[PDB]
């Protein structure tokens with residue numbers, strides 16, 4: 277249901293932003309947005325714990341931001357290990373996680 | 388409904404902070420029944436305290452309890468928080484004590500494991516707590532020497 | 534002119550409420566002379582407390598007095614009224630306790646017959662008094678979890 | 680750097696007023712180690728208190744210390760200054776007590792010789808201190824009888 | 826500080842029922858929830874459900890509402906603030922489309938809005 281934005285990449289050192297949105301039934305307003313780093317076929321990792329705060333042990337270069345319609349996640353100071361697949365989710369207190377489609381592409385600067 | 392004395396000891400710090408009056412009461416209603424000496428007034432005069440040093444020994448235990456109360460009320464006093472159960476101070480939180488964020492602390496931790504994690508720096512925090520007031524003492528000092 | 538210790542016990546509640554300091558003093562100036570032990574320092578050392586359990590028994594009486602003081606100061610503390618002799622609260626007055634109007638209460642009744650008329654619901658009022666604070670604890674709780 | 684317990688006893692009144700917390704602490708950290716009874720818990724049970732009245736005698740000394748603390752906290756209480764170490768009042772300063780100006784008092788005198796110079800009128804000042812509050816009691820009394 | 830061990834992987838033909846075991850340690854098993862999530866090969870991964878080890882209340886996705894049975898073994902105490910437990914996951918009707926990677930996870934916080942949110946994951950298992 278939730279449609280994650282198209283995959284965007286960038287050279288190391290700059291910033292990259294991925295967005296997440298969906299219908300007004302599961303839109304980003306009045307819901308909580310979570311972001312995850314998910315290497316294909318491996319153990320995932322939690323990045324943003326809610327749209328504006330982070331999980332214990334997350335670098336401050338990973339910031340979040342959510343509007344009244346769509347949510348975003350920015351990654352500054354790109355590094356070699358940033359080449360992975362990422363997924364978003366929407367949740368509340370009594371509901372479940374609704375995963376986004378995904379943004380998989382990430383590139384290195386100077387290869 | 389109220390969980391009872393020390394009921395929220397396994398609850399999140401926020402939940403126990405809601406029922407701190409419950410833990411506060413066992414400081415007084417253990418010692419109201421003993422100072423009462425109403426059920427003690429008639430039973431063999433004063434529970435035969437002659438040739439019974441357990442009676443004095445018992446009494447010394449009662450003394451330790453009110454003495455501990457006086458220690459906590461003194462600390463609340465010298466921190467300017469005598470009348471209140473929750474007071475905010477001027478001491479900033481040095482991050483070396485704990486690196487945990489607010490949500491992880493108040494909605495993921497209990498007061499027991501918190502007190503265990505910070506028992507190392509309690510004396511330092513108390514020192515800043517005894518010190519920080521001293522800048523209020525000094526502001527009042529400016530108002531005193533005009 | 535001041536009627537003396539417990540002088541306004543037969544006066545209207547308003548008049549006694551004017552001289553509550555007078556009743557407050559007998560909590561301290563009975564116990565200042567005994568803790569002094571200045572007139573006790575030299576008389577046969579410590580009033581021969583060896584083989585005299587009345588001495589210990591006497592001491593236990595002194596303990597009960599300071600223990601009662603600590604009970605009242607604890608109650609003033611958990612009601613957030615430590616520093617003040619007259620404090621107003623947030624608890625509304627349920628009419629089932631007493632139906633008397635304000636003029637009849639403060640200008641027609643003494644504290645004795647009032648305490649006798651309300652001794653039935655004292656525990657309930659204390660429960661609301663321990664409870665009501667808990668909503669202040671919760672407002673401070675909102676300021677704590679941001 | 681902090682001069683230590685009673686360190687500013689020979690300093691000007693302003694300097695000691697800056698380190699009154701230091702003198703305040705020896706009321707509690709003498710009595711924390713004794714109520715602890717941690718180093719006392721195992722040594723020959725409760726330091727053999729049977730057939731040893733020095734043990735009771737010792738205990739009575741501990742009682743006098745907490746009793747003196749309760750005297751000072753009562754005085755701070757009835758003056759409406761429980762929570763604070765420095766409080767201002769409504770009592771005006773009668774010049775008959777001391778004629779010295781402010782600069783000579785706070786930057787030329789120590790608390791010892793001041794307490795010696797005013798020990799004559801201490802009771803009178805306390806009487807005004809117990810009395811002046813009574814006008815606050817009366818203002819609250821106006822708010823009570825509507 | 827916690828660890829989530831998962832059972833060994835196994836391939837069974839469709840039509841039969843199976844069971845996944847997720848053993849815990851390094852935290853208080855009754856404190857954090859237990860989530861089960863599947864990574865679909867060829868489509869987007871989907872959350873399946875969560876259950877409280879303590880409260881026992883379970884809430885599943887409607888995509889697996891009447892096809893999944895969850896159970897939580899009673900925690901085994903270790904330290905003053907560490908326990909060990911076992912979480913079990915079950916499927917009634919097996920098919921070829923059920924093939925994919927599976928994971929078990931724990932909760933992030935004990936209270937608040939992000940209570941059942943998956944935080945610490947297991948190594949994963951593979952299917953038919």
Ligand SMILES: *[C@@H]1O[C@H](CO)[C@@H](O[C@@H]2O[C@H](CO)[C@@H](O[C@@H]3O[C@H](CO[C@H]4O[C@H](CO[C@H]5O[C@H](CO)[C@@H](O)[C@H](O)[C@@H]5O)[C@@H](O)[C@H](O[C@H]5O[C@H](CO)[C@@H](O)[C@H](O)[C@@H]5O)[C@@H]4O)[C@@H](O)[C@H](O[C@H]4O[C@H](CO)[C@@H](O)[C@H](O)[C@@H]4O)[C@@H]3O)[C@H](O)[C@H]2NC(C)=O)[C@H](O)[C@H]1NC(C)=O
Nearest residue numbers: 369370397398855856877879880882883884936937938940
């Ligand atoms: C000891 O430790 C354990 C830790 O395991 C701890 O348990 C935690 O308890 C706290 C509260 O005390 C929980 O924190 C809050 O929980 C709110 C949810 O409560 C409701 O929802 C529960 C989930 O129900 C789901 O499933 C049903 C289908 O079964 C579905 O319909 C629902 O919509 C939902 O999806 C539910 O279990 C709970 O319990 C009652 O209801 C169920 C039926 O639903 C019934 O079976 C139970 O027997 C019981 O009657 C209740 O219905 C959660 O929402 C909240 O988060 C925000 O939302 C609320 C608004 O609802 C806000 O008011 C709140 O302030 C928050 O902002 C918050 O997370 C926590 O989740 C528990 N953790 C667990 C279980 O792991 C114990 O309390 C501890 N005890 C002590 C004494 O320390």
Ligand SMILES: *[C@@H]1O[C@H](CO)[C@@H](O[C@@H]2O[C@H](CO)[C@@H](O[C@@H]3O[C@H](CO[C@H]4O[C@H](CO[C@H]5O[C@H](CO)[C@@H](O)[C@H](O)[C@@H]5O)[C@@H](O)[C@H](O[C@H]5O[C@H](CO)[C@@H](O)[C@H](O)[C@@H]5O)[C@@H]4O)[C@@H](O)[C@H](O[C@H]4O[C@H](CO)[C@@H](O)[C@H](O)[C@@H]4O)[C@@H]3O)[C@H](O)[C@H]2NC(C)=O)[C@H](O)[C@H]1NC(C)=O
Nearest residue numbers: 536537539540541542543544545546548549640641642643
């Ligand atoms: C024990 O219980 C008894 C209950 O019986 C209680 O007595 C009550 O005492 C309170 C005060 O402590 C009284 O309450 C106030 O009284 C005010 C009146 O006081 C003046 O007027 C009295 C009446 O004099 C009348 O008669 C003379 C002629 O003789 C006439 O000229 C006057 O104009 C008036 O009509 C008077 O008795 C009283 O006493 C002195 O004066 C008389 C001479 O007048 C002298 O003989 C006495 O020996 C004495 O020297 C005084 O003169 C009353 O006004 C007041 O009501 C409002 O008015 C005043 C303004 O004046 C406001 O300031 C006040 O705030 C009020 O708003 C109020 O009612 C009460 O009346 C007594 N009740 C009685 C006697 O039944 C004791 O005090 C209790 N004691 C304790 C320790 O608990």
Ligand SMILES: *[C@@H]1O[C@H](CO)[C@@H](O[C@@H]2O[C@H](CO)[C@@H](O[C@@H]3O[C@H](CO[C@H]4O[C@H](CO[C@H]5O[C@H](CO)[C@@H](O)[C@H](O)[C@@H]5O)[C@@H](O)[C@H](O[C@H]5O[C@H](CO)[C@@H](O)[C@H](O)[C@@H]5O)[C@@H]4O)[C@@H](O)[C@H](O[C@H]4O[C@H](CO)[C@@H](O)[C@H](O)[C@@H]4O)[C@@H]3O)[C@H](O)[C@H]2NC(C)=O)[C@H](O)[C@H]1NC(C)=O
Nearest residue numbers: 682683685686687688689690691692694695786787788789
């Ligand atoms: C016990 O009792 C004694 C009483 O005898 C008491 O001594 C008093 O101590 C207080 C402070 O604790 C003094 O009060 C303040 O003193 C300020 C001056 O301090 C500086 O200046 C001193 C004088 O130096 C002169 O000489 C040098 C050349 O040698 C020259 O360069 C200077 O410019 C100046 O002319 C100096 O002694 C002092 O000490 C250090 O420095 C000297 C070198 O200068 C060194 O030799 C010493 O060993 C030491 O390292 C320091 O340099 C004074 O200014 C102040 O008045 C106002 O000014 C300051 C700004 O500077 C404001 O901040 C302040 O708030 C004031 O508004 C104030 O008077 C007091 O003078 C002492 N009285 C004496 C000595 O008689 C002890 O403290 C008591 N102890 C206890 C525990 O009770």
Ligand SMILES: *[C@@H]1O[C@H](CO)[C@@H](O)[C@H](O)[C@H]1NC(C)=O
Nearest residue numbers: 479480481482483484485511
């Ligand atoms: C806390 O204090 C330590 C030294 O005690 C210091 O290294 C650290 O920078 C401080 N943290 C702050 C000021 O945030």
Ligand SMILES: *[C@@H]1O[C@H](CO)[C@@H](O)[C@H](O)[C@H]1NC(C)=O
Nearest residue numbers: 625626627628629630631657
């Ligand atoms: C007081 O409480 C009683 C029950 O305890 C109730 O019947 C009555 O209506 C209350 N009075 C109020 C709310 O004024």
Ligand SMILES: *[C@@H]1O[C@H](CO)[C@@H](O)[C@H](O)[C@H]1NC(C)=O
Nearest residue numbers: 771772773774775776777803
């Ligand atoms: C202080 O009181 C005395 C009598 O006790 C008086 O003579 C003097 O004038 C008073 N000083 C004042 C009011 O300043």
